[PDB]
Amino acid sequence: AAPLVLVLVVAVTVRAALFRSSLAEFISERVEVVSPLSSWKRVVEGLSLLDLGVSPYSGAVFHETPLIIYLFHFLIDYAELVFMITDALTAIALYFAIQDFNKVVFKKQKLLLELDQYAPDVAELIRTPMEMRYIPLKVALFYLLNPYTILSCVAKSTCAINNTLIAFFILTTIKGSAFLSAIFLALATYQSLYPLTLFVPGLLYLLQRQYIPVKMKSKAFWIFSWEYAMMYVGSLVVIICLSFFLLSSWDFIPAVYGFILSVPDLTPNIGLFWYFFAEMFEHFSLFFVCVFQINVFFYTIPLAIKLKEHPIFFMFIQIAVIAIFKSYPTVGDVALYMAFFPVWNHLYRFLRNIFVLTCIIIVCSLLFPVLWHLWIYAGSANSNFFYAITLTFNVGQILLISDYFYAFLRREYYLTHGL
Template sequence: MPRNITLILTNYFVGIAIRLWLFFIDYNTIFMNRVEISTPLNSWRRVVEANYISKISNSPNPYESDVIYEPPLYHMFYMVLSNLFGEQIYLMFIIADILTSYCLCVAGKKYLETLFKKEISNIDDYLPDAVNFIIKEQEIESVDVYIVAAYMLNPYIIFNCVGYTTTVFQNLYLGLFFVGIVKKNVFLASISLAAAISQSFYPILLLAPLFVTFNDKRFNATLVTTLTLIISGLILIISSFLNPKWSYLNHSLKFILSAPDFTPNIGLFWYFFIEMFEHFRTLFIYSFQLNVIALYVIPLTLRFRQDPVLLTTSLLGIITIFKSYPSLGEVGFVLAVLPFWKHLQFYMQQGLLTSVSFFMVTLLAPTVWHLWLYSGSANANFYFGATLAFATAQIFMLTDLLFAYIKREYIIKYGCVKECDGQEAVLLLE
């Protein structure tokens, strides 16, 4: 058996074993109660409660109470899965993680193969010393090992799975979207993105990489984007048949955009809206939402329009940092995509800083949470400080990736020889 296959299967086996072990020792209850993992938008406990409400004859509509915040079509999907798996519902979450990691493997390998062929075809245009910096075949062969490890052994993804969150399905939709754009499969990309948009709205930013992916002679980008929006509309229409009063809109789209729940999480919304005066709320809601939805998408699209995969990753990073109700499962997905750019590791400078920051904040956040709410020896500022540090670490990681991409792009095009006044430049530290 080839070495790569052995390592991949080992990563899958270890990842599944860890999840099963945590399920069987009932640690899932602890993870389900953690605000860093479970939010009002992805809590499976709310899904179970909504299922129970739907079965009560005198109160069949779960959207009449503040229980579930996803469209009725997804609620029905969860009910079907619950009835199908029964007490073995944990298998559903494990299967979703396996499928997502496989999608990322397919997308990552195809992406690097495409990039490798492109660079080889343009090799005559590079300077002699720049040839040493193009992608190597060994990097393509090993990328699937790193992707499986980054997803199946990622603590954030494991917490997300064991904590029973619907983010596992969101990650699966996004994994399918990656496959759709790297393989230029119109229907797969459109359907998966429409499913993600309908569930949590913020993936609407990914219409930008969808557009630039299919903006060539073979496809009509406008039609593809329109198709995605039509599928999203169909999901809303089907949901309206399941909930004719349209009350679910107040518990899905409106809830996401207005952020009325101030339960602390790893995001930045909750603290600001607890502290501010009520008459400033509308101004800050618009400011925060425009920051994540509109501020970055145009400049990033213009700069990285030639690489839709990098554009998708950067926009997902923006979403996980600034959305109203983020969770560790979404951050873990972005981290799992980083092996796509293993060839950029040489150019990245903040790896140690971001790694240590993620590790320290992951340990610090539950500690200050306990000190704040149980010991009474801290306050909200302590926990918000941890979430602010977590957001800063994500920003450093994302900017480091983008700068590394630009550095490599420059070196391949112009070489790495630096000259000053016709002589080789030397950097001296005094």
């Protein structure tokens, strides 16, 4: 109780201290922290264009949804308070979700014990109440005190609101409400397109909570799936139709979703698209954009075949994949799946090459600003340095995720067959 309040106080104090210093303007302009879809300056530009009588979507600078326009129209003066509130909200939601999940896990593990479906000598692999006591508080601390999250907050990037919506989706799903879950997933899909892939894991968790078997010759399964899908799609339809009536146009749609899907702007970031499409042969551009945006939606089905009985680990992997392979990535997207590492640290004995990967990620994080400076202000370097750093960062992320997946499977094998 007191630990959570103390953590919140420390996080708010650090953010408030950094808001008043001489580094806020420097932080607000980093290409690693803001994107053409997240910058605060584009928000104020759109609001000014509306007061000059021009449509915000008639140019090439503003790519935000109308709901952001409404919110910040009413709260432009109190901007710095909003982001603190949102970060606290996502931390608290994660805390309570993890508490409930741990209860389910211990109860499920306890039930198997008497059905004696575990090997005779498998102990020291059994979860105990003394070790799961401080997992939620840790999760909250890892989210709040991550430098990526603090940097995102001081820059007033819109990614914080997206993270809050995802965290509320997780909280409502684990607590067992499907209507609110569908609403929050629709709100997350409205802002960015990729969160639609989290539809399958949440449905699997809900079905498992109802004790409904998942089979092709079942009746409850199909009815539940149909109801959930209908609620989600209706939510999306109503939000879009409501968005039409703010400015009486459909122009926001190509400005947002077309921009995400087609990647016209070539500003550098920590992703894999910008330099590839600045150095492309025009004959193959369509084929390559199609391939590299199918890659994101590719893994959901086989992962759902393998991880059918473990929906939450499935969610964690899917969020990491979205963060790695999106068109305009930011460190704020990276922090969200890093917040989940404490949940999976009982798998530490089966991890291999964790040390080198952590060191490499840490080094690349510091090497981004120095090489940006040497390229853009000194003139002593070129874009190849920056491209190499982005390549190394993404490779390290992929290796780390694969390691966690391997450790999970190895522990399952040892649980079933004997240590």
